[PDB]
Design an enzyme around this catalytic site. Structure first.
Site, PDB file in Angstrom:
ATOM      1  N   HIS A 111       4.758   1.049  -8.653  1.00 35.72           N
ATOM      2  CA  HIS A 111       5.898   1.961  -8.827  1.00 35.72           C
ATOM      3  C   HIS A 111       5.550   2.974  -9.895  1.00 35.72           C
ATOM      4  O   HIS A 111       4.778   2.677 -10.837  1.00 35.72           O
ATOM      5  CB  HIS A 111       7.118   1.173  -9.228  1.00 35.72           C
ATOM      6  N   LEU A 147       0.816  -1.193   0.000  1.00 38.02           N
ATOM      7  CA  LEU A 147       0.000   0.000   0.000  1.00 38.02           C
ATOM      8  C   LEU A 147       0.859   1.256   0.000  1.00 38.02           C
ATOM      9  O   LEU A 147       0.340   2.351  -0.198  1.00 38.02           O
ATOM     10  CB  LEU A 147      -0.972  -0.024   1.175  1.00 38.02           C
ATOM     11  N   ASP A 207       0.748  -9.703  -4.881  1.00 37.77           N
ATOM     12  CA  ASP A 207       1.985  -8.942  -4.743  1.00 37.77           C
ATOM     13  C   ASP A 207       1.847  -7.582  -5.480  1.00 37.77           C
ATOM     14  O   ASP A 207       2.800  -7.103  -6.139  1.00 37.77           O
ATOM     15  CB  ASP A 207       3.196  -9.719  -5.273  1.00 37.77           C
ATOM     16  N   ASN A 255      10.665  -9.162  -8.551  1.00 33.94           N
ATOM     17  CA  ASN A 255      11.409 -10.053  -7.653  1.00 33.94           C
ATOM     18  C   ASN A 255      10.389 -11.005  -6.995  1.00 33.94           C
ATOM     19  O   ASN A 255       9.462 -10.538  -6.337  1.00 33.94           O
ATOM     20  CB  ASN A 255      12.160  -9.249  -6.563  1.00 33.94           C
TER      21      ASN A 255
HETATM   22 ZN   LIG Z   1       6.003  -8.040  -1.719  1.00 40.70          ZN
END
Ligand SMILES: [Zn+2]
Ligand SMILES: [Zn+2]
Lengths: 291, 422, 291, 141, 422
Positions: free
Chosen positions: B309, B64, B305, B278
């Site tokens: 960004h 978040l 996940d 990742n």
């Molecule tokens: Zn994560």
């Protein structure tokens, strides 16, 4: 605006046309290209920069040099902003050498009114060195088709190998690699390569061996135990000299690491020929992009 | 309204083994009755004719970015994406700034989330203070304030004794460790160690970085009796090791990012930095292994996940922040497993509801009588696109930006209250 | 020997004559000045040095570059001795950029047979940037008279503001400043300025806003708490973009500190125009001093 | 030092930055019957070259804030009052400085001061007429 | 109730120059009407016959110990003491753990205080990051989140350039600096440098530590145009220096701790560690100077510096934490200035209401029509004792523990709602 970023973007016809110009320039062709070029060597490499600079000047191109990036690192300023400044200053060509991988590049290149020449971007590409190596081999043998070309050393970090191997493949040569196993990419098969564990077996197979510069950094990174052991395992030693047919070396030689100090200038060495062929190949690239 | 009815819809509550065409009566925020043709005068009505009705989705892996990186996303924009994608409960990661390693940060998140009032936000704490890897965090204060798990995400724990200690203390508290498995000595580059890294010379992240840490975690969970949850499995060897430990009765669970089910390392060639994540997108052989892992029950749940960004953090792959957004995009991503006859619809629902609920030990993911009215209503066949018109995240970092998606949330109901409508 | 050290030494007529030449050079005027120039960039600034260098070369001036001072710091050697060496080497022009304030300068300049061009001296002057900013504003609006020009940022350390503000004042524009209060000189009234505490109020008043580069150093010096808070308080954010009429930025942009990374090249941005106008203004300066 | 012939103690042309040090020096000096002479200019507020005024704003020369001097004068008068020491302020250059000195004199504090005839003749604008020959600590205001 | 009436009481609103026997009508949390004999059917009634009615008190100096030291006090126990002592607005200090130097801590305090719902809690931020004295804090983010002032309390700022910079940035934002004036080179001992330190050999804190920093702050406020607020004046020289700068039009304010009005350094001999405070209790001559300072208008307001410490932090004076509690004890402490004919009742009220309201720039401390119904109702003559029966703080650290107090709060009304009843 045409650019040259990667050997993977070259068609057969384009390689033929560049190497034709290179040969004419080697034979004494003269030409005037009325243009300016900025040589932006963020990563310094004197030998390569002098070669691009002297190529450009002999074609009448006005050259401007930014070297070290002149203290690199403008904080907050991207590579794009730098290129966009060059465009605003009215440069026709930007020859750039940078310590990072310039990827993706297609859309950035498209957005700029500049002829971009990649003189090395990290571990990615060095198209003019690929072409120079191709040209040198071709000058010697006539054709590269069916030649067994062995690259020895740090394949993983090698933009010269990534630029030359696909050109040689495109024209029917066979690529081999040999180096510390820690420095051979696991999927090096993407380049359609024979892999030798032992450099002696590699030397016996090869028509021509290209020793890649070993960087001292690789020792501290634990890829190799020492430079002198690397020389013993992989380098061109005096004992190996008797067996080697012919050999090359792109950057400056790391003496007694890559190649024995006595073996740089011999009748089997095309090292000085690559230095000689750099200007005519880079003139051909400027000319190729002047459309 | 005192009373709500979800009418005419096709109900699937896998935890109860309930399927068929029932209506649902909600009262005082709780599931009251489930029955064929229900009516009460002037009770509020939601018409689900032609739609799937199931328990509200639970995503146990969301960033978040709140506090400290709220230009990427915040609790409100995050909770909007969540409900727009069927989620009535999400679990936020502790890698915020300041990190979730004290009760002030926990309480800030709980109270802010309570204000936004769309979506249950359940925090996790760090494994180590500052996520610096050196000192164990205060599990006890953190659990008591509301943390439901401990993770150093997106960092690995490199010291095995630290991980062993965290598992011991967490099990003593009845909560799991969520582990980002990626040995930092073998995974410090940018993309998968495969054909794209070889071709382009981008630095790589070895699959073994992940496998080594999964193996370590399953061994530690077996020896401590702790519960470890593996956060984002991406290889076939990883799934073989997880199953090795499950078959021994070890409390090890795992989740899959729908992006590792859709995409390989070649997506780096098509989406550039929007494919940087990742652990990385691996090969075709790993992608198919993951799908088989979902089919054969090794993988316990889907978890996005959701990792926003900004666009300036997504340019040159070398310099890009790792992460992909996915809250709004999870359902239609899962739904092509269903369309391809890989999983049943019930199974799809399990993996979004009761499976993740049991991993975090929460009594949700269910339409049991008396349980909170967290209900999701969807159309498995409705098409749309995630673009500027439909995106609720402050970011756009997904290889699915601009692609046609099939399957869509029509309603999200949280505690008997409608919180999202198509 | 004429010199250009400070915007405060320019008369109206001189500014008119420089900007007239700049406009002719922008429109394609060609001229040969048979001279040599040394570019002495003790403080490196690639963008400014390339602009002076390309301006000079397009006028046929032979350019020589001393950069970094080439390891700065000749101990025991003054700035005067360096200039006096240039005079002995027969240079016609010295374009200098130095990290100190060159003051007093009148008597030193008088003692040298050189045309000195100040390309930036510490925190004091940068006349060509002042003129470029003036020219850019004037190209856009026709006249600068009565315009409300807002400078945002580190006014205290700004040689660009000290060079532009007096030029804009001389021709009837109104100057405003906005920045961290720690970076506004207490007697900034010497420049006849409106002072805004709040950048939003400043943006509403302004016809054009000139964001000054924020140096990371200012954070460690305690003038600001952080770069990202500075951006929030003073920078061109996406929310502020809707309100801003038009904007500029002299040096390289410190992205997401001065100006949002998406807002550098927009229809409201004259940033790329300033880059474009640098060569024609600097050609005009060489020409102006060639008397 | 006093026994050999020193008539006062000063760190001129440096300020004493630690107040406990200045307090201690005043105590020991008063015990010996001699004054402290203080160069009052807080080094955090006065590390530039000229006055913080119109010339520094105009030219961009680094500045020395008048408050550097005043802060230390106030400090010194307080310490002289509390220790009973005699402090002598070395080169007063602002109006606020003189108002603070008089505040303490009016209380019977042993505080004296001197003026440099140059601060009586010249302002910060002399930097524009004499250049470096107008550079002095504390600056011409 | 839509409507409330405070009936029969003696009203004093000094900001409006209003005194006499009026009733007050409150509606929707705001002051509606002030008038002789008011009535509306079934409007709620508070009977203030025989009592003083005035604006809710404002204390601009409170340690709530929340987060991080909540065994000493918390927002709830703090807000209970506050309302029990007539305070409808308090300003909390930033020396919590974590310190108030980011917006997450600010927001935690705002939301927690909103839940407790008794008392407006207004946070301040630090001057430096971590109160470490090295880097200025983010004034802008902090002010925007709700901080009303910046202080490094209970640390001094030792670098004058830092203090100068903080004043500049804060004035640009329209907020004051609150300074704990005590030069750390001259004040590192435990009690006043006076007769008790000489007698007992306890390490001392020189009065000059405070005066030097007050003088510095008034000079900086004059030169920057910033507003500095001096937190706890304790000597006569301090008051002479403050007045020197006020007389020049400098924006410098100050407050007095009622404890420095009651007690000298000799209280260390009677109460031990419960008399340990920063700055220390000084001599008789300073005590009387302070009272004269309150009388002659140099001191702008009372502020408790409510500083709870546990009993184990209050044993040997050498090792005791400095601080005294005072929220519940402020009114009767001030009231003996009134009984001794030193200040009028109106003046007493000013110093608890409109004076502190203007220092923090808040539109409170008033019964102006339209303003929030923050009302305090007290009995200036009613006796009681602060002991275990009456103490609302989690701590007991006061020289007044067990003493008879005269003057007491009967009602506290915050936004039209009764929040405290005797
Ligand atoms: Zn994560
Ligand atoms: Zn305090």
């Amino acid at each position: 605006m045409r650019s040259l970023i990667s050997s993977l973007d070259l068609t057969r016809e384009e390689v033929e046309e560049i190497l034709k110009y290179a040969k004419e320039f080697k034979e004494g062709k003269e030409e005037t290209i009325k243009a300016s070029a900025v040589l932006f060597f963020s990563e310094p490499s004197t030998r390569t920069r002098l070669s691009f600079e002297k190529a450009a000047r002999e074609l009448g191109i006005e050259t401007y040099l930014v070297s070290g990036s002149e203290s690199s690192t403008v904080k907050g300023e991207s590579f794009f902003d730098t290129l966009k400044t060059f465009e605003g200053l009215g440069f026709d060509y930007v020859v750039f050498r940078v310590p990072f991988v310039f990827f993706p590049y297609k859309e950035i290149v498209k957005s700029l009114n500049l002829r971009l020449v990649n003189a090395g971007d990290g571990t990615h590409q060095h198209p003019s060195q690929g072409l120079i190596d191709f040209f040198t081999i071709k000058e010697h043998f006539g054709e590269v088709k069916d030649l067994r070309v062995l690259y020895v050393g740090d394949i993983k970090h090698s933009r010269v190998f990534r630029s030359g191997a696909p050109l040689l493949n495109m024209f029917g040569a066979k690529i081999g690699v040999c180096g510390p196993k820690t420095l051979i990419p696991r999927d090096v098969e993407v380049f359609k390569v024979d892999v030798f564990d032992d450099v002696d077996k590699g030397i016996d197979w090869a028509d021509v061996v290209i020793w890649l510069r070993l960087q001292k950094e690789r020792q501290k990174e634990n890829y190799i135990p020492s430079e002198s052991s690397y020389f013993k395992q992989f380098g061109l030693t005096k004992e190996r000299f008797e067996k080697v047919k012919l050999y090359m070396h792109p950057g400056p030689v790391n003496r007694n690491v890559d190649i024995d100090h006595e073996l740089v200038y011999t009748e089997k060495s095309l090292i000085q020929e690559q230095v000689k062929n750099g200007i005519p190949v880079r003139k051909a690239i400027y000319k190729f992009l002047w459309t | 309204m005192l009373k709500l009815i979800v009418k005419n819809g096709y109900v699937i509550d896998p935890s109860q083994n309930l399927e068929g065409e029932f209506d649902i009566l909600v009262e005082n925020g709780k599931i009251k009755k489930i029955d064929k043709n229900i009516l009460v005068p002037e009770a509020e009505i939601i018409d689900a004719k032609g739609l799937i009705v199931c328990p509200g989705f639970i995503d146990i892996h969301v960033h978040l970015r709140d506090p400290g990186q709220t230009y990427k996303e915040d609790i409100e924009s995050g909770s909007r994406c969540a409900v727009a994608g069927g989620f009535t409960t999400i679990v936020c990661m502790p890698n915020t700034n300041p990190p979730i390693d004290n009760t002030t940060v926990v309480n800030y998140i709980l109270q802010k989330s309570k204000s936004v009032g769309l979506c249950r936000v359940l925090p996790t704490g760090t494994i180590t203070k500052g996520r610096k890897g050196k000192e164990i965090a205060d599990f006890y204060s953190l659990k008591e304030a509301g943390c439901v798990a401990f993770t150093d995400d997106g960092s690995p724990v490199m010291d095995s004794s630290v991980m062993r200690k965290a598992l011991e203390l967490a099990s003593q508290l009845g909560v799991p460790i969520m582990d980002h498995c990626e040995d930092d000595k073998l995974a410090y580059g940018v993309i998968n160690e495969g054909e794209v890294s070889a071709l382009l010379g981008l630095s790589s992240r070895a699959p073994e970085a992940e496998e080594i840490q999964i193996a370590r975690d399953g061994i530690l969970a077996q020896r401590t009796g702790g519960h470890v949850h593996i956060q984002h499995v991406s290889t076939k060897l990883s799934l073989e090791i997880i199953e090795f430990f499950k078959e021994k009765g070890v409390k090890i669970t795992c989740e899959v990012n729908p992006n590792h089910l859709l995409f390989t390392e070649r997506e780096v060639l098509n989406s550039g930095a929007n494919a940087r994540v990742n652990p990385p997108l691996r090969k075709k052989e790993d992608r198919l292994a993951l799908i088989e892992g979902v089919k054969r029950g090794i993988i316990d749940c889907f978890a996005t996940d959701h990792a926003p960004h900004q666009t300036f953090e997504k340019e040159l792959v070398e310099f890009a922040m790792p992460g992909i957004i996915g809250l709004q995009t999870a359902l239609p991503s899962a739904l092509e497993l269903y369309r391809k006859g890989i999983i049943s619809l019930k199974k799809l629902i399990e993996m979004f509801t009761i499976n993740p609920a049991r991993i975090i030990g929460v009594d949700l993911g269910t339409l049991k009588l008396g349980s909170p009215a967290d209900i999701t209503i969807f159309d498995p066949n409705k098409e749309w696109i995630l673009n500027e018109e439909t995106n609720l995240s402050k970011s756009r970092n997904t290889p699915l930006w601009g692609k046609v998606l099939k399957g869509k949330v029509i309603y999200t109901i949280k505690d008997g209250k409608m919180v999202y409508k198509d």
